[PDB]
Amino acid sequence: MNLTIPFAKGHATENDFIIIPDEDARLDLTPEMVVTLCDRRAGIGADGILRVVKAADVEGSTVDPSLWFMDYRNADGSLAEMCGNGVRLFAHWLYSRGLVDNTSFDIGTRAGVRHVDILQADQHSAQVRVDMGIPDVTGLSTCDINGQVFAGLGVDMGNPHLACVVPGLSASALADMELRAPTFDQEFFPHGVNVEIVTELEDDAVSMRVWERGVGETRSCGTGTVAAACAALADAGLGEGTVKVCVPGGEVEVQIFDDGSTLTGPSAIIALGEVQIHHH
Amino acid sequence: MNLTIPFAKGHATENDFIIIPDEDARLDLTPEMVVTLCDRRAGIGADGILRVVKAADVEGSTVDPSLWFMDYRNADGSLAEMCGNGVRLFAHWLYSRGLVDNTSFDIGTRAGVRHVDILQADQHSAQVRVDMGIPDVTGLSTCDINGQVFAGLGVDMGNPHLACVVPGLSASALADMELRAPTFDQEFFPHGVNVEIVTELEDDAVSMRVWERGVGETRSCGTGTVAAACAALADAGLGEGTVKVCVPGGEVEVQIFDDGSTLTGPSAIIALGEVQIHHH
Ligand SMILES: N[C@H](CCC[C@H](N)C(=O)O)C(=O)O
Ligand SMILES: N[C@H](CCC[C@H](N)C(=O)O)C(=O)O
């Protein structure tokens, strides 16, 4: 006995999502079902899910009930407290379908409210700026990736990061290295952690790869790019700045003040349809 | 300037396809476009494409123009001469949408005509039997996978195979081994080759993994299962038989006579929609 769910597919710097419209709040998917859908072969395939729902109808939220809420699920069914690339696609979706009518608006997330600015938008593409709030640098920790250690900044962007700027690493060296789920200090990161490997600041740019909690390597990670841009700035001895972060799925521009931070990048809406899945 | 293409997503033992309806024969996709679509993040994601077209309107075919033709493309844009799992999903599609009206019919492929029998069918599931023709054992060759050599049968099933039955290998040992694109004799396989690693016959069953030409590891390979079932039977000293082949995405039953061979397995239709893609 299978359900038929309307959906759209999209990405933001090739970090890709399945959008489930759910204003009547009748598709709070179980984690098994999330897994099934984010399986490319068995389902559709994605890095995770954006279920579109009002804050009024989302369990555990206490943000303004009148806002749209970005119910993000990771590909393993795991919840997460924020998703930078997600927020951009979610904004793109809402605007482009006329579910809001300003280029500038607030969205609810599991880390609270996030403001967005639509800079450019079609049916299929957009550029979105996100107020990401203040990066809270949590301390210093390390990880091991494939019997080699790196030292990083803990950063809280809503969710946890370990941003390891690597002294001397070229971009081509970085493209080459082979990643395995890192191992980290579980007292420091009791809930798991997103890890970013980063090149040092140069021409106001860094290059990054990332091993997402819940998911594995992704072609981009928006909260992680901001984490990386802190780390790169801190390693150059600044704490304000504008940094272009280069990820396997593209480019974003992060901006860091003392009062806050922003993440500006593209978003794309690739497909619409309906999908089959089994309850059991 | 982007095209909007109606499509369906489906699989056959988790070897998954994008179905493009194209009776007016106006979507002979270029290989770049195939690649874009079979990219999960950038497009939809699949092991390959089944474009649905009449034999009349397919370049290079000389089969009966009145038949439906399975225009199969691999995920790298590469054409291929047959696709076993594809044929089952293609039959499922045609029947279930009422584009044929018999449970038993002929389909055109790049290896010529293939007969099919629909055994069970819904909107969403089916069991299909395929007349695969005669396995032609081409000789003996070897390959290397990750600095280790295996010896195999060359088999022509339409397309080329190297079926390596491995003396002593358990299923759990097989689940464990780590695969890399094999290296093979290019005089023997001037066009590339599908490689199957197989366990010895036991309880009329073998277990198999496969590194598809054009694609890489797949959860199943229908022509390869028949290749594997020959090899396993030959290594047990028979040349007729009924063999259950176990693949990471499930199970199929292959049957071998002297007059021919059949492949019976499941098929599923997971989603319908429309997708965006760029000409340039
Ligand atoms: N790709 C997302 C990250 C999702 C976070 C999730 N992987 C986690 O914290 O577990 C981003 O744009 O920020
Ligand atoms: N998965 C397909 C194999 C496609 C063959 C293609 N990989 C090639 O010959 O290059 C099958 O069911 O037989």
Author numbering:
A (entry chain A), B (entry chain A): 1 to 280
What does the paper say about this structure?
Two catalytic cysteine residues are positioned at the active site, which is located at a cleft between the two domains.
In fact, although we added a mixture of the three DAP enantiomers (l,l-DAP, d,d-DAP, d,l-DAP) into the crystallization solution, we only observed density consistent with d,l-DAP in the electron density map. We suspect that the l,l-DAP substrate was converted to the d,l-DAP product during the crystallization procedure because we used the wild-type protein. The substrate binding site is located at a deep cleft formed between the two domains. The carboxyl group of d,l-DAP on the side bearing the d-amino moiety, is stabilized through hydrogen bonds with the main chain nitrogen atoms of Gly84, Asn85, Gly222, and Thr223, and the side chains of Asn85 and Thr223. When we superimposed the apo-structure of CgDapF with that of the complex with d,l-DAP, it became evident that substrate binding had induced the CTD to move towards the NTD.
